[PDB]
Amino acid sequence: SAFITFEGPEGSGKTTVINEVYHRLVKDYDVIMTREPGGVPTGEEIRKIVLEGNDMDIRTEAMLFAASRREHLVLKVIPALKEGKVVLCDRYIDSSLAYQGYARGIGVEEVRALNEFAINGLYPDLTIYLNVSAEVGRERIIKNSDQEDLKFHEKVIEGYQEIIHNESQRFKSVNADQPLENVVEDTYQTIIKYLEK
Amino acid sequence: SAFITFEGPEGSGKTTVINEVYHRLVKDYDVIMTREPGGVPTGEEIRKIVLEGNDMDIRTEAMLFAASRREHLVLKVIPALKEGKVVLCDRYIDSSLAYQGYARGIGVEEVRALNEFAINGLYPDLTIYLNVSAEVGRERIIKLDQEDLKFHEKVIEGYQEIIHNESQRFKSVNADQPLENVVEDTYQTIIKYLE
Numbered sequence: 001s002a003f004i005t006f007e008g009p010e011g012s013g014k015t016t017v018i019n020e021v022y023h024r025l026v027k028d029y030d031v032i033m034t035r036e037p038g039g040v041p042t043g044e045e046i047r048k049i050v051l052e053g054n055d056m057d058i059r060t061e062a063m064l065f066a067a068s069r070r071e072h073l074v075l076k077v078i079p080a081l082k083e084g085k086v087v088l089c090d091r092y093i094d095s096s097l098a099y100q101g102y103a104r105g106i107g108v109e110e111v112r113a114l115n116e117f118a119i120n121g122l123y124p125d126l127t128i129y130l131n132v133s134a135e136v137g138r139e140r141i142i143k144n145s146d147q148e149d150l151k152f153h154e155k156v157i158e159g160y161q162e163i164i165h166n167e168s169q170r171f172k173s174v175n176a177d178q179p180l181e182n183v184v185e186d187t188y189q190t191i192i193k194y195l196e197k
Numbered sequence: 198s199a200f201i202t203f204e205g206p207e208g209s210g211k212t213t214v215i216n217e218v219y220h221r222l223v224k225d226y227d228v229i230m231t232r233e234p235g236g237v238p239t240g241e242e243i244r245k246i247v248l249e250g251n252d253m254d255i256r257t258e259a260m261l262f263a264a265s266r267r268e269h270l271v272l273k274v275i276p277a278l279k280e281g282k283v284v285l286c287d288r289y290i291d292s293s294l295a296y297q298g299y300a301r302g303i304g305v306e307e308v309r310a311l312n313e314f315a316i317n318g319l320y321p322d323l324t325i326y327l328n329v330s331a332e333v334g335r336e337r338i339i340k341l342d343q344e345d346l347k348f349h350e351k352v353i354e355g356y357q358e359i360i361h362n363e364s365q366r367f368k369s370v371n372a373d374q375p376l377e378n379v380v381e382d383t384y385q386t387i388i389k390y391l392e
């Protein structure tokens with residue numbers, strides 16, 4: 001079994017990359033792709049609270065992402081891993097670290113402690129980081145489309161770089177500035193290398 | 198202003214005590230009584246999840262109590278304290294430590310770390326622990342089965358562990374006494390602190 005997560009800011013081509021990689025991997029592996037809340041009832045109810053939030057306190061928001069994360073992990077991820085599957089998960093702990101911890105300013109360490117309570121030692125075996133420059137990301141969120149939104153996007157990227165610097169061994173950075181066909185190929189090759197070894 | 202929490206197992210007389218102490222304190226202080234979620238919209242929505250169906254994982258439950266706790270603190274407790282109020286809060290961090298941490302078996306240290314994330318340094322100025330024996334508590338509950346009795350005993354064992362890592366904020370009141378005495382001791386403990 002293997003638990004692989006995908007991370008990156010908006011404009012990194014993430015959703016498109018995970019979908020294409022998943023379509024290629026199913027040919028050779030027993031794999032599922034999911035994301036939180038991923039249809040788990042309590043997680044879906046938590047998502048409604050988050051989306052209905054009127055200027056929600058950032059720590060309450062971080063706890064709701066963590067509670068949805070645990071429900072999705074216990075009811076969906078863990079049973080698939082026990083069946084020997086490869087699980088591809090679109091966003092996991094590192095999204096809370098980059099967004100809630102770094103960009104929103106709670107602190108990466110504090111958000112990590114909250115998430116360790118939620119995941120109870122179940123870190124990913126491998127995390128693909130779709131490394132898009134702030135400039136390319138900005139353009140992918142202009143062509144397919146504010147100073148405070150641009151500043152937030154830059155802060156999310158800065159947060160992912162701090163996370164990757166501190167836990168390099170768990171991450172594989174993929175150049176997401178390339179055309180999407182190349183990003184897909186590099187991501188697929190990185191995953192097969194890990195799965196075959 | 199003062200943030201005062203009340204803790205204890207079921208059958209400790211906690212409801213009677215808070216209400217009676219509120220009626221005495223209102224003569225001299227601008228006092229409010231509250232409990233989580235306490236009417237805060239997001240907290241009320243979290244409470245509906247906890248109550249309205251699931252076999253729910255104990256850690257998800259602990260995180261929902263902590264999220265409701267933060268919403269109640271930020272939208273209800275902190276604004277009342279800024280108005281100079283004495284806030285009497287029925288259950289706070291120590292209930293998660295005794296119930297989720299100890300009795301449900303997640304671990305008190307794990308639950309404390311989760312709750313410190315939720316309260317971000319806002320510990321009570323004073324916490325009244327209504328120290329009832331399991332036997333007296335069980336008699337007040339009837340005024341249940343083996344599983345329920347053992348869980349109640351485990352909650353009390355949990356509070357003893359928390360109160361063992363004692364000092365300053367915690368004030369233990371003998372809740373085995375008749376309720377008029379528990380109320381008097383609680384009121385006198387609170388006035389001593391406030392004055």
Ligand SMILES: Cc1cccc(Oc2cc(S(=O)(=O)N3CCC[C@H](n4cc(C)c(=O)[nH]c4=O)C3)ccc2C(=O)O)c1
Nearest residue numbers: 036037046047050051064065068091092095096099100
């Ligand atoms: C309970 C729950 C879990 C996941 C999503 C969700 O709801 C949404 C939030 C947004 S978003 O714009 O808030 N944002 C998009 C960028 C990534 C963000 N993110 C993600 C994770 C997993 C995290 O841990 N922290 C964090 O900030 C969320 C956008 C869309 C949705 C939706 O599912 O429709 C609610």
Ligand SMILES: Cc1cccc(Oc2cc(S(=O)(=O)N3CCC[C@H](n4cc(C)c(=O)[nH]c4=O)C3)ccc2C(=O)O)c1
Nearest residue numbers: 233234243244247248261262265288289292293296297
């Ligand atoms: C979101 C939220 C917060 C508070 C209550 C709530 O909903 C209830 C849960 C129960 S209970 O039987 O689960 N239980 C009763 C004994 C004390 C228990 N307790 C309390 C706290 C504050 C804690 O941190 N941990 C913990 O275990 C809860 C009983 C009644 C209700 C209701 O309000 O109707 C939901």
